[PDB]
Curated annotation (Swiss-Prot), chains A, B:
Its EC number is 6.1.1.26. GO terms for biological process: tRNA aminoacylation for protein translation. Catalyzes the attachment of pyrrolysine to tRNA(Pyl). Pyrrolysine is a lysine derivative encoded by the termination codon UAG. The gene is pylS. This is Pyrrolysine--tRNA ligase. It is found in: Cytoplasm. The chain holds residues 188 to 454 of 454 of the full protein. GO terms for cellular component: cytoplasm. It catalyses: tRNA(Pyl) + L-pyrrolysine + ATP = L-pyrrolysyl-tRNA(Pyl) + AMP + diphosphate. Belongs to the class-II aminoacyl-tRNA synthetase family. Keywords: Aminoacyl-tRNA synthetase, ATP-binding, Cytoplasm, Ligase, Nucleotide-binding, Protein biosynthesis. It comes from the Archaea.
Amino acid sequence: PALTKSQTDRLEVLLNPKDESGKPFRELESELLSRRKKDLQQIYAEERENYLGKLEREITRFFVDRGFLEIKSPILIPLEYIERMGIDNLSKQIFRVDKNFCLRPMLAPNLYNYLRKLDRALPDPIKIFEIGPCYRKESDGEHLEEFTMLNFCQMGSGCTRENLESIITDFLNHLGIDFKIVGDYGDTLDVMHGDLELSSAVVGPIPLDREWGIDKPWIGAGFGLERLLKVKHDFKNIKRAARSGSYYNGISTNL
Amino acid sequence: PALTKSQTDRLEVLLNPKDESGKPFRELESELLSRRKKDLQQIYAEERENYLGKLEREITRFFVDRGFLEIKSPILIPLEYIERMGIDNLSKQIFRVDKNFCLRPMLAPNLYNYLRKLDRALPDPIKIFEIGPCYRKESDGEHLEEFTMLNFCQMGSGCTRENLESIITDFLNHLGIDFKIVGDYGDTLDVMHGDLELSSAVVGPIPLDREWGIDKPWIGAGFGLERLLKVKHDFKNIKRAARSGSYYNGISTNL
Ligand SMILES: CCCOC(=O)NCCCC[C@H](N)C(=O)OP(=O)(O)OC[C@H]1O[C@@H](n2cnc3c(N)ncnc32)[C@H](O)[C@@H]1O
Ligand SMILES: CCCOC(=O)NCCCC[C@H](N)C(=O)OP(=O)(O)OC[C@H]1O[C@@H](n2cnc3c(N)ncnc32)[C@H](O)[C@@H]1O
């Protein structure tokens, strides 16, 4: 009669945010399975684009159109970059590779490097952004160990908290994601969606800048793409938005 | 009078495939520096798109339009997948992470998984592709340790060597890359550009398939994006096309 907790989990896996007691487990499952196969069939026949890849392309067009240079830097970076970011023995939340490298847990390091180098060639202000894989050993989850970050930044003139909030606002209203900016330069703003942190943004300059050869004011923000997708598609668990073999655009692939 | 080998290397770094003795090093360098800054300035003012990111988007549109489903799977995969690919103690060319994972050296594993799972929901034939970071400890270089692979595959009907060659041909003529297919099912074709291997393609089925729960015929090919860019932009060294802090669209960032 009553579904076991295990059966309920199984059905939840097959449940979509938009689906709407009695009937036995096998029938409820057979029903959801047919719906999910049809969903996949519709995607394969029409769209064919992956949510994460498509979001990245949409975000890229948004920043490129607003004057930001598109950066693609290494994912495997020197461990020294992590120390240089002020993270000495969070240090174990780092995925290490070999003796001197690791999987970037964030984008700041390579972006700092580009800001410094580009300043010798580009007119002020320097505007850049990167979208790509970042890695952090996790606990909760909202928390993926493998995720995708969008980090944009501007250095030089126009680097005010007001301009930063304006970019964030246009960006999220563009994506159709509800949010609230919270704070109270050297400032740190938290872009929230309910209790979920969408982004921790900062208005420089900050003491860390010196360690990277940066001496100008700057503004920047980092957003996790899977979180945006989770909020956007009303996914209950963020793993439905992650690179995975278990879900395709939020649809279970275990059919 | 004569440039030292070190000065020549420096100038080569600043040299673009399209630039065309006497003058002293400092003057030759100052000349190249101004040109490179202008190049970067033109990119920042107009395009703003990264070569690698832009190629990925172009390849994606190409396969999506031809009926292939866009896949974004994990970059950090179980070490077991490598053994399962038939690579037992090349095994040390693998970047290991923690005790049970590694950085994917290729895309086949996750694509095999998707072919198996999608077959339970999608009509024949199943066509999918992925574009993303792959990692392999290297020696030569043509050889990056961090690169980007495009792997597409079709399973079920239509999986002939002829159809495979046709896709490869349309793809490369589309990108404007000269090539030659060489070979002699269970077939392996090498797509060459002069002496450079652009892709090692295969016509299944192959014995390995069974280990992945795949029992249908299939065709597939893997192309390294940095190599395509290298050939396309006539870069002398492939590192000019890689994710890097040292080059931006083939232009030195050490100005
Ligand atoms: C000049 C250049 C230097 O720029 C900076 O130094 N800082 C720019 C300000 C941007 C913040 C920085 N990129 C950052 O990493 O903030 P934080 O680490 O708290 O993470 C920001 C966002 O990444 C996402 N995120 C994090 N970990 C996860 C996870 N495990 N799963 C899913 N989503 C996640 C989430 O959106 C989180 O709010
Ligand atoms: C059903 C699914 C299973 O599909 C398959 O099992 N096989 C599909 C056939 C595709 C070949 C496979 N993806 C592969 O990896 O072939 P191979 O490892 O020789 O590499 C293919 C290409 O990757 C590129 N590549 C490699 N290593 C580098 C490097 N270090 N720097 C730069 N470029 C590089 C280069 O283009 C090379 O030819």
